[PDB]
Amino acid sequence: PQLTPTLVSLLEVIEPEVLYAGYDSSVPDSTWRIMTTLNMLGGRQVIAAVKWAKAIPGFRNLHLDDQMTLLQYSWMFLMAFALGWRSYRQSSANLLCFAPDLIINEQRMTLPCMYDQCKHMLYVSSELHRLQVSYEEYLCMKTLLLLSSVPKDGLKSQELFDEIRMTYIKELGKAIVKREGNSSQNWQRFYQLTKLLDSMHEVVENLKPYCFQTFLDKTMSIGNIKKLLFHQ
Amino acid sequence: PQLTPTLVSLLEVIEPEVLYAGYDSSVPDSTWRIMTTLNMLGGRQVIAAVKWAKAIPGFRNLHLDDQMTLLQYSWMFLMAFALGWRSYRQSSANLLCFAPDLIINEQRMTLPCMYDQCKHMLYVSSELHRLQVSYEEYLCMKTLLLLSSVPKDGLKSQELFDEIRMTYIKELGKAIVKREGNSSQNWQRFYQLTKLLDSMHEVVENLKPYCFQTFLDKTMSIGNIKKLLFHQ
Amino acid sequence: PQLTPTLVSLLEVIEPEVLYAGYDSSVPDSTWRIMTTLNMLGGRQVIAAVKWAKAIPGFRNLHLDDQMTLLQYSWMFLMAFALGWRSYRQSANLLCFAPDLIINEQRMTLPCMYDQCKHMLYVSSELHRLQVSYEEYLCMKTLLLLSSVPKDGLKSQELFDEIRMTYIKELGKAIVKREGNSSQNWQRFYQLTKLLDSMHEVVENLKPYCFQTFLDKTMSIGNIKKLLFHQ
Amino acid sequence: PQLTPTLVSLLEVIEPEVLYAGYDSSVPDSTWRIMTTLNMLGGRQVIAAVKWAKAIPGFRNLHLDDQMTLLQYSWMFLMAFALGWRSYRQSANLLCFAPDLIINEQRMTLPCMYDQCKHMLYVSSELHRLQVSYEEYLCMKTLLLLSSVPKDGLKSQELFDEIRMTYIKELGKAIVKREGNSSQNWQRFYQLTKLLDSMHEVVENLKPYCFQTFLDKTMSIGNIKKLLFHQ
Ligand SMILES: CC#C[C@]1(O)CC[C@H]2[C@@H]3CCC4=CC(=O)CCC4=C3[C@@H](c3ccc(N(C)C)cc3)C[C@@]21C
Ligand SMILES: CC#C[C@]1(O)CC[C@H]2[C@@H]3CCC4=CC(=O)CCC4=C3[C@@H](c3ccc(N(C)C)cc3)C[C@@]21C
Ligand SMILES: CC#C[C@]1(O)CC[C@H]2[C@@H]3CCC4=CC(=O)CCC4=C3[C@@H](c3ccc(N(C)C)cc3)C[C@@]21C
């Protein structure tokens, strides 16, 4: 079985191991210390995303400016969706599993300024629970999130990009079929999953101001983008 | 000799090894790719600074909010000063040695938008050449840059901070005396070195807008601080 | 093309990056210092081999005892073969243990260096003579993991046999990409699998030196069936 | 207080963080699997010891051959002593090889486990009996690096002798911090250095098992002066 490799079995081998936050649990929580730790963890996960993306079949065949562009547009999609997946696998409670040593449960979301950020991220794990997403579906979906936005005037390797995206869409279809439902159910599930991918644009739009804000505060001490939607 | 440890011999053992940028030299340069690489390298160096600071004698005895505060205020001071040191040790040319595999020489500073950033960082290496700073002087100076700003209303462990800073000032004095000049020359050199530390406030003020700008562009795809000056 | 994955393209993505030896070039060379450095580089390469093997499609499906057994038998096969490849790609007749630790002609004169390095240079020269491609090499290295089993067999013998047969077929596919006719592809499979068979002799000549370095520099002092392609 | 650095506070900053074994707890234990895991953990701990030693004030000033010689003689001393410490701090009579690989009472029953672990548990129980402090432990571990030299001497013998005498004095300073009177401090120095001397016996009992595991699981098959504190 594994002796006949598919695209998704390749995506499974290139998925990196979870990073630990390094958060000291022996000291009282504060929003300050959590957010500082998440900023450093966020930077490390961006590094992991670059290495991951370069291993995706097809990605390194795009023009180098295209690769940089897709990673710049999509990194928050990848991060929020992967966070959703870790939270979904951790528990059926309403929590965010940023790292195995930094889990934000309902208690920690009572800390000042935490909940209004976390509610947009909890939407992702809630959708994953509702749809009972499998690991192979998730892997295909996460690759597609890398391919979710392009410049309004197009990529340099636009024709190749279109072939790559269409292929990972097909791969998501095969992952769905593996759930052994019937054709009518597979058809509807494709809608459900790709609707979730579409809604990630809104998740990210709502999270970007908070990323901006924490940069201004803790680091600085202070239209041209086309969304590739599955459903209009 | 090394069998009698001093504070500076401790600072020498906790100094981390240089990070590599991972920059592909087989592909033409562009400002885009350099800046993207420097942003990722910058985040990794912040991680290194946190680990370093926690090993500095005295630092972990400050209140945890004070530690976070000092690292938040000073990280750009540490980064620009260490960059100055690596550039100063690399060559007497006007270059910035961000990493052994990413050196910005006069040629690469002709790339668009590069020089106006780099001129503020070249000031640091030029001052190091002018003063022929030793490694032990540098190590003491870099610790002092961690201690270069505090909140207007003070730190939680203000009294302990004052003792720590005064001790690393004394340690810089001992490093100066090791150059085996006479007392009149040692006195003047203390002024020269601490004047350079003072001027780092202006270096950082000039670099922060460019950090802000690259965050807005490549990441987002878009008064309460007292300076501790040596000379008024 | 990469959008249609093959076993060999999976083998290409799990191939680990080359390790550096950490050898100080600014100090006079010494047989003592090279061998100590290689002992520590060797231990790190074992670690890399365990992680690589666990990602080989099919390998994790074998019984855990089988996994451990195949890694114990084959680690020196894997290391010498990969060394041959690195040396062939880096070129002349030089052993390229790491980018910062190359046994050049001068270092060969050091005592006991040549008598060890001669068996390893054989691997590098055969790879050069046969003009082995990267995809052939990756299939061959996987086969070396599967080159020896216990006399009594493995606990997952039936699965092992399927796994090994599949990577044999995968080496055939890599051979066919060299664009020869079928008669030449058949003959090239012989040439490549002869080299694989000859690794048993290479290894048997290298194990004593490994043993003596362990006794010297670390302690300061039968039931295995070879799976040969050609009898 | 840290603002006045001592040799022992430098030893505290260069002490490496504990390594994890990577041992899968969700699978049935096996003597085979524990020993293979410990073999790879051992190799990684050697790497940590080399980096640690190069940062010991004075060590890099010895001749490079001396450095290599002291590390070859002493690595098992360092590993067993640090294991004793980790086990003493972590609890009962348990060997704490890594946070994820503890030899509990059940794992002791596995074949050949106890006969090895008994010599290592001796180290842990002595540390407990003597209530060794962390600063005493760090000085003692450094002395173990300096516990054996070649019969003919070292190339930097005079410097070595100064280095060793300085860490002997540093263990004395750590003893004095326990706030006993001078007569008790004198006697505690005897007790601690007796334990150091007894590591030679511990190691000599552990080397054979290291040898046999190497022959079994890796190959699949005099001129040294002990520097004793008490004759
Ligand atoms: C709690 C919380 C929070 C947030 O402010 C909103 C979304 C978070 C982001 C994505 C979801 C996310 C997932 C992770 O596992 C790491 C942390 C993380 C973040 C955080 C983050 C902070 C800074 C960066 N930089 C600039 C690259 C990247 C990520 C914190 C974010 C912004
Ligand atoms: C060329 C150039 C340039 C700059 O835009 C001005 C100063 C640079 C900064 C300090 C000097 C400096 C030294 C280094 O060695 C790494 C790179 C580096 C930087 C860069 C940087 C970018 C992003 C961050 N984040 C937000 C933590 C940190 C550092 C690039 C900076 C800002
Ligand atoms: C020069 C030389 C030499 C040799 O003594 C002969 C074969 C070498 C071996 C395989 C070929 C080889 C390839 C490498 O790239 C690393 C080094 C290496 C070695 C060395 C080695 C030493 C000890 C171990 N242990 C016990 C796990 C593993 C590898 C050195 C070896 C034995």
Ligand SMILES: CC#C[C@]1(O)CC[C@H]2[C@@H]3CCC4=CC(=O)CCC4=C3[C@@H](c3ccc(N(C)C)cc3)C[C@@]21C
């Ligand atoms: C249980 C058990 C056992 C033992 O066989 C006896 C002593 C162990 C040794 C020292 C005590 C010790 C402490 C550790 O924390 C790691 C493991 C360890 C070992 C093991 C070891 C095996 C091989 C090497 N090589 C050859 C460098 C190094 C260390 C296993 C040893 C030999």
